[PDB]
């Protein structure tokens, strides 16, 4: 029984897919407290949008750059959780260690069923390297605790 999650964080350059501005580095969003909407998935698999509720500058620390099978990367703390194809939110290091698949997403269109729209891909983490100390951040959302990155990966949001 998990007491709580680690206070994971994303590196400055990690781009979040915003509705109003498209891909934007989380560092910019937080540093400038940019009000915009992100895409998230609910417990029943519906993809929908929600406005950011909290902007947290987490300071700095050692971060790793994980490389995905399609060449994209995730720059974050090793314990940052992401959605897998089994629909579990697990640390990126676990996904790497166990070679699990990240569940990624490659008129009115929203909200829509995750499995019946958008190009769904099953992407493994093929490696990682250290980027040294970088500025880190996270954002809090008013509803579900996850949001889509520009590379399609679904990241866990702040639980505070
Ligand atoms: Ca694959
Ligand atoms: Ca892509
Ligand atoms: Zn936070």
UniProtKB/Swiss-Prot annotation:
Signal peptide: none annotated. It comes from the Bacteria. It is found in: Cytoplasm. This protein undergoes a protein self splicing that involves a post-translational excision of the intervening region (intein) followed by peptide ligation. Belongs to the DNA polymerase type-C family. DnaE subfamily. The intein is a split intein capable of protein trans-splicing. The N- and C-terminal halves of dnaE are encoded by two separate genes located 745 kb apart in the genome and on opposite DNA strands. The dnaE-N product consists of a N-extein sequence followed by a 123-aa intein sequence (Ssp dnaE1), whereas the dnaE-C product consists of a 36-aa intein sequence (Ssp dnaE2) followed by a C-extein sequence. The N- and C-extein sequences together reconstitute a complete DnaE sequence that is interrupted by the intein sequences inside the beta- and tau-binding domains. DNA polymerase III contains a core (composed of alpha, epsilon and theta chains) that associates with a tau subunit. This core dimerizes to form the PolIII' complex. PolIII' associates with the gamma complex (composed of gamma, delta, delta', psi and chi chains) and with the beta chain to form the complete DNA polymerase III complex. DNA polymerase III is a complex, multichain enzyme responsible for most of the replicative synthesis in bacteria. This DNA polymerase also exhibits 3' to 5' exonuclease activity. The alpha chain is the DNA polymerase. This is DNA polymerase III subunit alpha.
């Amino acid at each position: 029984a998990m007491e709580k999650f680690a206070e994971y964080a994303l590196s400055f350059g990690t781009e979040i897919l915003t509705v109003e501005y498209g891909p934007l580095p989380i560092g910019k969003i937080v540093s400038e407290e940019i009000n915009c909407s992100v895409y998230s998935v609910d417990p029943e698999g519906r993809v929908y949008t929600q406005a950011i509720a909290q902007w947290h500058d987490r300071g700095e620390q050692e971060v790793l750059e994980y490389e995905l099978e399609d060449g994209s990367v995730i720059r974050a703390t090793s314990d940052h959780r992401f959605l897998t194809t089994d629909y579990q939110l697990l640390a990126i290091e676990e996904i790497f260690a166990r070679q699990l698949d990240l569940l990624t997403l490659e008129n009115h269109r929203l909200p829509f069923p995750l499995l019946d729209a958008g190009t769904i891909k099953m992407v493994k983490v093929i490696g990682r390297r250290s980027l040294g100390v970088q500025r880190i951040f996270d954002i809090g959302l008013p509803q579900d605790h996850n949001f889509l990155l520009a590379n399609g990966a679904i990241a866990a949001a702040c639980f505070n």
